[PDB]
Design a protein around this ligand. Structure first.
Ligand SMILES: CC(C)c1nc(CN(C)C(=O)N[C@H](C(=O)N[C@@H](Cc2ccccc2)C[C@H](O)[C@H](Cc2ccccc2)NC(=O)OCc2cncs2)C(C)C)cs1
Ligand SMILES: [Cl-]
Lengths: 99, 99
């Protein structure tokens, strides 16, 4: 598919057995998902945006479907106002920016 | 070009006649450049992301070249951690996400 950028590039994702909306974000190294009770072990992390740092929980090897494309990798969970799919998962679904 | 996402999608920009590197950022509504001297009028603004808000100088109608492609639009100048080209200018250069 092709997604234009006139509005935020939001798609449906499936994570943890839940459907959510998330932003496809070429400017994010990592994937940051809103607070959710994912099972299993995690590691504390701090990540920085414009603005400063926030505390997140790093979960590894998390299965996630992005606009129908299955992916597996690290997901950072914490208090974000928007779910962000970053390059660690965008590469897995073969996404490019084109102009 | 087609830009893959294994690496950060950094490109060279020309702004105020100066070369800088900036990140092509589909998750950003706006374009935010590090503190610099820039010709043109400005007004104070705030912009936010992960970590909270920062104060910026909003410059409208600024001529900028992004990877060799011309855009003319709003540039926010302030203490951003990295130079970001957001959707307001990615749309001008005809960028899309594809997978
Ligand atoms: C729900 C509501 C609050 C929303 N507002 C918006 C519109 N807004 C404010 C933005 O787009 N704001 C932008 C932004 O930070 N966008 C963000 C998503 C977001 C939006 C709002 C609230 C929280 C997160 C998404 C952006 O790609 C930023 C860009 C960035 C890159 C490196 C260093 C600093 C910043 N990426 C990150 O936050 O993580 C970046 C990481 C740092 N180093 C490598 S990756 C820019 C202006 C910089 C979208 S959703
Ligand atoms: Cl939008």
């Amino acid at each position: 598919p092709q997604i234009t950028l006139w509005k935020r590039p939001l798609v449906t994702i499936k994570i943890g057995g839940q459907l959510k909306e998330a932003l496809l974000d070429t400017g994010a190294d990592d994937t940051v998902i809103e607070e959710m009770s994912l099972p299993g072990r995690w590691k504390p992390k701090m990540i920085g945006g414009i603005g400063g740092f926030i505390k997140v929980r790093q979960y590894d090897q998390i299965i996630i479907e992005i606009a129908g494309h299955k992916a597996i990798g690290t997901v950072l969970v914490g208090p974000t106002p928007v779910n962000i799919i970053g390059r660690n998962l965008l590469t897995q679904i073969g996404a490019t920016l084109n102009f």
